[model samples]
Target: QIDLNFPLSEKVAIVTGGASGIGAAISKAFIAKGAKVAVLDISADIAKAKAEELGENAKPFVCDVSSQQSVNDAITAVISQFGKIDIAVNSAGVVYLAPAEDISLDYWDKTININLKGSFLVTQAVGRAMIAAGNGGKIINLASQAGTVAIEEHVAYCASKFGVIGMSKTFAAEWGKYGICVNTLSPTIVLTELGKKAWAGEKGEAAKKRIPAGRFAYPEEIAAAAVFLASAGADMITGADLLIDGGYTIL
Candidate 1:
């Protein structure tokens, strides 16, 4: 029996970087809610493996989020397969923890290229599909707490996240007339496997103490918000930042 409780019933979603971490979580969560998800990643093998793990509702699409041609091509393929795109989660991003003075020039560009430009590329291609369909859709970009507050050794990541918020806001403004909703999700440190390694031991302890919630976020928590953002429940909300940062930016 089809579950009426599935909020995303019959929807099609594209999740960039859907192979692992927060992206993977969002991909699975979208599937659980009855959306057929296209998992896009730079690695064809990883994307294929992830989609297989996600069961029949998921399909793998190899895409390099940093490359506009790659994104455009993959998006065109997704439209051909799914026929329409109802939601998009621009979760493809990279972070290199480095002091501003010590960050390599290429590394800075790498951070921006993946986290900022990738989001735009995916959104632009997806936006075109949504517009052509005349069925205004949803876009959820992954911003971060680093975007709003200074985090030591996170200069490049911070800049990219900040740019994500700005880009999403602009997209919202440009796409509203077409019924598209563009927004961002800013989460505090997420405790994904990758995050656990980075935020573990004494550093993690100290970081948790700073948050009013006294803990880091889980990938599922962020995914939950993504689900809501892509749901009709948040239809009227656009050009906004949903802070899942546990009050870290309250200062």
Candidate 2:
């Protein structure tokens, strides 16, 4: 069994979309493990508020991951505030559900830009920093089970997530020589407030029945997986997808 006590003391982490949901949970988890974190989100006010609530170990930076300059500035800010980045969690993404024919070009582009392009930008920036620092680091990208299995009305989301997994693998292969590990975490529907509302009622029940675990995951559960990836426990784990799907994809 992997050690439950994963040490992250003296590490510095950057969590994009860290203002809320899974991202927020990841930031909190890292802090609990004694890592200083920079919470980067487009929602500047909310991010700042969350950082304040998380206490001194958390810092907030306004960042639009889709924009190159925004990501660069945020990373620069993180280095300025925390000195160096040892781990990066790319959790900034948007989801849209619509039939393939009903999906507008604009809608597709919006989702792709934020979910795919944004992830690439953040990963590249952080990867470069890690390489420069010469100490190596961990890069965890948030993909989805939709990436592995086709889901109706999730065409764009599936495409973007699939792209994330592919990108993560390439990064892992390329960066491994530098001691930087790259991996992706694919989770089923998680029970964040937003998730609860989105997957509620009869439809949600039907979906839950498909999972062997009989329930959706919690944000903190996903965060725990992320912590494992970021810790030394997962040092040899690269180019891999850690599925926290409650066995949903097994069927």
Candidate 3:
């Protein structure tokens, strides 16, 4: 366990896409600090299993963040379970890799809907709840290093992540007075399970070699940043983008 002085005991948190990868790491880290967490995802079975693995303080709520109705329902469910929401992290997203000319309009729209629109929906739904409850809350958005710098063959994914950064800024401007901090966390080329399967060959190794840190970050590293932003130490931090790119952008 990584020791850090961030008090989250009894706080209620909702993590979108919390079933696996970085999302799963954040959920586990939050629970370790004594927070009650709700794993929100479109996949009910995966969500349920993760919640079960985390035991009593963690529960799963089926939600498709791309839909406003689904986002609202999930937030309502979290509120019902824990009285009010203290933190909400939007980690649900998709990537579409294709040559700029080869990208279909439909596929582009789908990626934006899930990644960009989905972040908005969850933040809005949970932000309203936090506002109504009259307590300060934290909203963490998962952006991409691609948002800072473009990547080849990632037209839609790059656009949506840029949108996430923009949206996070607006959220912070409007919600900061209410004690809410809205921020974006961007990671670059982490070797996730999906990465292992999708780029398991030489391509993945080549990408790793470019990192100035000489390595890809583990999901746990990203989780630490998420937890810190949700803590009191980050109370004054809002509308900021935290980058964990391993210096990939510099090169």
How do the predictions measure up, each by TM-score?
0.96, 0.98, 0.96
Give one digit per residue, the lDDT tens place, for model 3 in 79-144.
Answer: 988999999999998888899999999889999999999999999999999999998899999998
Best by TM-score: 2
Best by lDDT: 2
Off by over 4 Å in 2: 1-4
Q: Per-residue lDDT of 22-131 in model 1, one digit per residue for the tens?
A: 99999999999999999999899999999999999899999999998999999999988888899999888898877878999888999999999999899999999999
How far out, in Å, is residue 15 in model 3?
Answer: 0.3
- Candidate 3 matches the true fold with a TM-score of 0.96
Cα error, residue 114 of model 2, in Å, equals: 0.6
In model 2, which residue pairs have backbone atoms overlapping below 3 Å? none
What does candidate 2 score on TM? 0.98
Indicate whether candidate 1 or candidate 2 has the larger TM-score.
Answer: 2
